[PDB]
Amino acid sequence: YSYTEKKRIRKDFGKRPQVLDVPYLLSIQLDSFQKFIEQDPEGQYGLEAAFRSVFPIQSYSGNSELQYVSYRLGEPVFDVQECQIRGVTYSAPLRVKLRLVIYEREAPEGTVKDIKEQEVYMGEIPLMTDNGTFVINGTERVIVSQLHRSPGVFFDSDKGKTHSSGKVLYNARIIPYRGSWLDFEFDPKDNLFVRIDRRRKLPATIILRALNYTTEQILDLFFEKVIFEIRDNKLQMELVPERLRGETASFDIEANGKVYVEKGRRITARHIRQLEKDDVKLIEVPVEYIAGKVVAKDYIDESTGELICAANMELSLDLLAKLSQSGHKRIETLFTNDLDHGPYISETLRVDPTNDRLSALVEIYRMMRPGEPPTREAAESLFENLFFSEDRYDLSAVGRMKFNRSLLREEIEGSGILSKDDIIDVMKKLIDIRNGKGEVDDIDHLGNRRIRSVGEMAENQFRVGLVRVERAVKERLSLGDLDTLMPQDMINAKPISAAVKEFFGSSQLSQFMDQNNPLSEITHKRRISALGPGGLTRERAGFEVRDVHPTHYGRVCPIETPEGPNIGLINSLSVYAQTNEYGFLETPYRKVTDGVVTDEIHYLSAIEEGNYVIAQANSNLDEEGHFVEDLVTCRSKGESSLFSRDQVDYMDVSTQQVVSVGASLIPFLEHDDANRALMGANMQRQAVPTLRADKPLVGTGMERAVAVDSGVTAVAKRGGVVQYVDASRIVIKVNEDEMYPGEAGIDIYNLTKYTRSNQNTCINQMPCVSLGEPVERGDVLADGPSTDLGELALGQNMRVAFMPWNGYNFEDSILVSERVVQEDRFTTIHIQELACVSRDTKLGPEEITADIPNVGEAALSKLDESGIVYIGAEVTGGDILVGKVTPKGETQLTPEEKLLRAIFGEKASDVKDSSLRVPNGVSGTVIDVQVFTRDGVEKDKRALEIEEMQLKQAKKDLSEELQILEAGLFSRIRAVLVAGGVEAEKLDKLPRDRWLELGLTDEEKQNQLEQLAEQYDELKHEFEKKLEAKRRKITQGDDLAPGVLKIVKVYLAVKRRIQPGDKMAGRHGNKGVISKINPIEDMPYDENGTPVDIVLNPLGVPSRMNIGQILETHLGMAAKGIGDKINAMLKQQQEVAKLREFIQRAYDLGADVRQKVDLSTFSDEEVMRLAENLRKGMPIATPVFDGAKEAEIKELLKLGDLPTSGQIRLYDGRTGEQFERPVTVGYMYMLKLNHLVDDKMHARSTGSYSLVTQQPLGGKAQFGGQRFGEMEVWALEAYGAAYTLQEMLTVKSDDVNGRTKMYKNIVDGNHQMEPGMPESFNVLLKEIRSLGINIELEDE
Amino acid sequence: VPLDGGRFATSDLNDLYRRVINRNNRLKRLLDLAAPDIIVRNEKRMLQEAVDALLDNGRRGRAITGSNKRPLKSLADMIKGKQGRFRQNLLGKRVDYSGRSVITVGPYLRLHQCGLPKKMALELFKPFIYGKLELRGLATTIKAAKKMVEREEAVVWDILDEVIREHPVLLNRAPTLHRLGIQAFEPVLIEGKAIQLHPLVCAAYNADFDGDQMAVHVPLTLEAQLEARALMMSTNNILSPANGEPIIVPS
Amino acid sequence: RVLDATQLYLGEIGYSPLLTAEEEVYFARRALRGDVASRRRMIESNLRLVVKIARRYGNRGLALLDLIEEGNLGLIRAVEKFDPERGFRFSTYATWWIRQTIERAIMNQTRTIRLPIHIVKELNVYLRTARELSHKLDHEPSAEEIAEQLDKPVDDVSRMLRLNERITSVDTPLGGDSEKALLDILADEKENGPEDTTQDDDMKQSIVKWLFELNAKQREVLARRFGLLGYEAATLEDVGREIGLTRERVRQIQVEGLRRLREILQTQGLNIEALFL
Amino acid sequence: IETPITANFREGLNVLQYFISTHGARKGLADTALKTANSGYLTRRLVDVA
DNA sequence: TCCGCGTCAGACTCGTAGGATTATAGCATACGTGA
DNA sequence: CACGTATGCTATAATGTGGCAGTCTGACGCGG
């Protein structure tokens, strides 16, 4: 085990050895964007792909052209930190080398005329953070990967479209990545049609005529041959035995000298095998059998040279006679059968109105451009530009690949443009499916659903930007002079920059990162969405796609998706699942050879998985031999049953891989209903970090992985000893073995302190190492907001009893002890941001002075000279944070105010009052202030004090960098000088500034001194230019919105304690609202005297079927039992030996404990630090389906001297008497959800009103009235409450006269109703007359 | 109207009216200039297109779109559908003297009572407190009454206590499926921000306290108060109107 | 049947003849000399040119059809002011008028708030300058960066970029969800709540009671100066028009009415209480 | 499904029993969110006619 | 008279957050109000 | 006059247009 794990080991009840470790959880985001910016030389990727796609472009004239060489990202002018504070996007400038080449029109392609090559700026692209977010306008945002229908081909069929006939119409759809859709479909009369972009319907054969196919060739393509030889007088026919099948013999079938079948006799298997084995090729037949056979090719009379019969024409006795006498004694007819080989194309040619290729191109042209006069130029251009142009059509590699595999081809890769072969092959396969050989696919199958990560979407928008600019470029290249015009004068950045900012901003998939919780972040970045551009709609979504698909196994969680209208479409990725190179989802599986289960792992795509049989992970292995039991539970073809051991091809890697990350954190998930578990995994994400990060006693093991991989925790880059711990930073000195020979080798991690989250929660990093501690690489140095010693800590475990209590836990209502509030453990920190904008108006600039009309000295006490509140100042609702005054224009003062101001004199000043004050009922401490001033406006005195702070703080930060780096660097030169001329204490006597003159013999170590000397000077000048940059940015006057002169941002910190109406839950989907905070005296307490923290209602278990919560409680109690026993042994101070004995016996309890943890390796001191942590309660891991069994939990309870029932005797705090029976008592790990009653409580009597409708506004942030909706109205109608209703329609809403008159009546006690007409009705009438409908009121 | 930031925001009708006026006046011009007939015709088609767009946009063909892609909201659209005048602003309304909060159990409550947060009730009964403050002579004027309630003075709580006695308040839960979705109670002032609901009427509201919220409405007039106390009071409305059965049943 | 306004118009223009130089000169000689037919045939023949130059100025303000009509109006000015005797071709001359008229129309109708040509053209040179600045400064340009390049006031640049601020639709719904838009948030600021309306009633009615409480000559002289009971808001010297006819005794009696009323507000419970207001 | 769940919640489900449970569950939940619109539209029609 | 295309509906309250884009030559003459 | 707002003219020849939509559904009428 590692050093951080030596401090606290989690006890594992898992039994299956984990062959594959949890991968990096934020893989998707980082790989994808990495591929977008990754400049690929040949195999175009991301930007590179975008440039090669559009470029090189030429002018409309064709003489002048723009070609692309190479691009570069400039390094970001502001880092992540400065971007977040300032509110700017973290981006890199895109500089692109482009070569304007011009051709001579006099020479053929005179390329040596004018070549102008230079580097053009066009837009800054947002950069992805270390943790897979983007910082847009100073807010962390995540782009969710998308799930859409894969480009390729797809065979489908509405099962009984016309419900009257109920006939199955099969269709094909070719879906490209870019271009028109090409649809093939059957009609009721079995005629093949073609439609482009679901336009008007066309006979399918018309498209083949556009590809230049004569009728003869079309029949030769879709149909076989039946040959008719005309010998002597009798007609002969070339026979294939296995055609005459399931049919009736219409005439007497005989061959050479044996009669097989008579007239009207059914031709069975036997007759066919008889005929085949007899070697029958020709059979004599009646001439009358031909009437109805269709001739395949043309036949002409060689004598006359005229058409005897055209292709696809039904033969008769007369045609046959004329054919014989011309000299044709062989006739190709179509092979056709009602049942097996359907004559579809044959009938479709009779429906085809077109004749030749031109006629077909015209008809196609006329479909898509109806009415407009056709030309040949236009028809050819349109048809080639549909599916045969590099420019407008591209299947992509994925499309061509899926297309070829669906058509059973061998070749994966190929052309993005449709070849003639492609179209025909699709039509052929559609026809095969109609015939009954082959099946239709389904859209929900993950073999047809592809995942599109960020980088591909950024690439797409970036192409659009280039296409928009390309329009401008071609238009200016046409009129442009060749010589004066520079390439960058034609390019515009605005369109590209606009397309990309519109993606990372307007897009549905780009949203505010859900960061109220490490798990919330990590699950949000591993989200898949079927919505947004190129996707389905909430309105447009059926139920098929939503429901759990068999392919979802090991790829997508069945148990993670919102219970909203977004129920099927939003989905978290499974744990071990990964994105295929082409974009399909894949899952690891252990290869089984000869029954022996190899440790070789294979990721199988959805399509590949169907083909093998996969054993379940729960199968018992024979210690690296094979399956123990001769029957094994496996699944293939999407369905599950028993198999033999040697039949098994593969096996599930992990028990966990079926579930997502969120669900994997639910212990005893095996005992919870999938519905409750869904709610549980969804609400775990809403858990707000408490003041004290408390680890969960009853964990799974994923806790460590989530905390570390989310990156909110500071982890060690390189192992070594900690040189300096601080609340603000951590310096670790690296070990010699890992420590590079160049630099000093001291890593400095600056910790991020109390910062605002997107949900206004508090993000703080605490250091979890001691000063001068040896640390391994990849250990947790500092905990993020909801993490404890590297494990995930989303809430807090506590002592719970399941029993009714006086109805204070009625329907999930929760009864909590005051003890919990007092201990401030559920207490939470909220950092809110208030801003004050000084704008320039028509009347003049607003001022940020403390000089405001009508303000008490009490209020102005907390404002400084500038008019900004001091740091540290406690504020409450209505206190002024930033004083702001606005120029007021002329106002007609009512005659009363003329009189009153003449009495008082007090002429009201020209300036008003726009001061930013504390929102009403919020109360906090000002922890920070930021001031933005324009470049040129006179700075506030406070802005100047803040700049003094930032400058001196910056100087200290950089000074400490160069000091620790110089000390660490000379400490190395001191060791290099010892290898050669060791004079340890003699060299340190005279000053360290005069050291690097001292050399050594000409060796590799003399060259090491030279390296350290060159870097010391490098750092010396680097420190100068770094400080200059810092000073510039601190002086830099900020560019704000037009109109805005300066902006002051105040950050408040509010401490919210738990109270009735706050929402709390476990991880088994057990919700509750706190009803009451009970005094500790009243709380049920045990015989020992220890009172419960929470009383939950047991009536919320049997109905819910979330039994996970009960097992968690029993095990949590057992965990706390062991904790109380270690705590008792530490209070006594028995000795290291005795603690070691108890602790070893405890870790190695379980029937088949996987993890062995030997205490003999642990040194005495290491044992003491472990026991010290385990006294709070021994941390236990219950892997998802590989969890602790009841037997193991009761055994653990016995080690705690706790009851097997896990029920204990409890005493009523009030009466002192015992409760009638044992109550289940233990520790459930519980969460305070984001839903504080402080945020939900609202009330309004009278306020602002809407602009047109005049009814009050909506929402608590806009001080809104509750909507009394149609449903709410009907309720009053049922009751008969007529005045209450009228009241809510009139004096309460629109009626303007009514509301004021009513208000005055209420203040005068008389509750009189003085109603009128709602203004909304007045508006309705005006809107209807604006329509030109006369609607008048006829009065009384 | 001008937004704070010097921005302007306007109705779509103005973009549509601008289209119609420009094409109509251009038609007057083309007629003054005696233009050839094909041009006259195109302008008349354009005028019909713009009028059609103005009255009912997405009716005849492609609705005329903004830069956002989204089709401009026409006259017809402001009367038509859920977002239209009838459904949204006229058969149902935003309403004054309305509040909302989380609900929680009040097992101590009697069937005719509900726990009403002090801060919530102070603001819902604002004018009644001002009127009583002038009758006590505690407040000289309305501005003084306002400032006295902002300061939340001790005597103001005593007045609030006086006003809410015998004053019924409506509690409502979404969705309001039958009339019992709204019931009247006598309020009981409580310190703490959550509404306390009587257990036995949890059935009518279909209310379970897993984070459910409710809305509060103040009947203002003497008539409305008596409508609440007589018709809508929870004690008065026990039996389901659907079946002759008591809806208030222990659970 | 094609009912597309565009397609029908383009169909009609298609079946009208392209002219050669000599023919243009023959027609145009008679067109200047007043031949209703000549002008019409030259117009109808050269509509196709209008459409070709109408498909370049797209996605800027109005629709193709809109530009096609303004373009036509430019071509008509060209036919009116064409010189047949000059060797220079018609298509060359017309191109100028069509581009000119289209550009000018997209400069007055393209913006909801009509921007004068002067402001628009000013703003345009600021924009093109910003583009050259961004082409070499990698990062987009500041107000002062543009101002430094043109050697002009920062306030000039700022006021012009403020005007460029493009409008927001009141009906545009917020939060992607087509639910509540700007209209559903935006209050009527001018229409005060019943709270403020009732405060003014109480204020005005308290002054009535105060007027019936001060002396008869003090509330006469005080009220009619401020125009409370009088009709017009007069000054110390103008109160002489009524019966006062005084300059000093009006100022002594004005302030005497005010001093007794200041004690009426200290006793009722305002003075420093209603000083904050 | 031909193979039922032989286990119970106290006993604990395995990966395949749980996976099989999911379908029915999510169909149920999706029905709540999506079908209540049509039920409510029926309420609305009824109210309007009476 | 049937097919096919069109039009019409599709629960109720709460929430969050603000917001996007482009570009229209250059100069001479003409019209209306304050100093 | 000036300042702000507007109309106006330019002369190589140039003469028919063209970015998304993604397919929803069960029902009820309305021209061929």
Ligand SMILES: Nc1nc2c(ncn2[C@@H]2O[C@H](COP(=O)(O)OP(=O)(O)OP(=O)(O)O)[C@@H](O)[C@H]2O)c(=O)[nH]1
């Ligand atoms: N209007 C509406 N109500 C919902 C929605 N989702 C859940 N609910 C309601 O919220 C409640 C949550 O489940 P419960 O009410 O506890 O279910 P129950 O009827 O008590 O049944 P058991 O849990 O089996 O005892 C149900 O009454 C649901 O009707 C929704 O999307 N819309």
Ligand SMILES: [Mg+2]
């Ligand atoms: Mg509920």
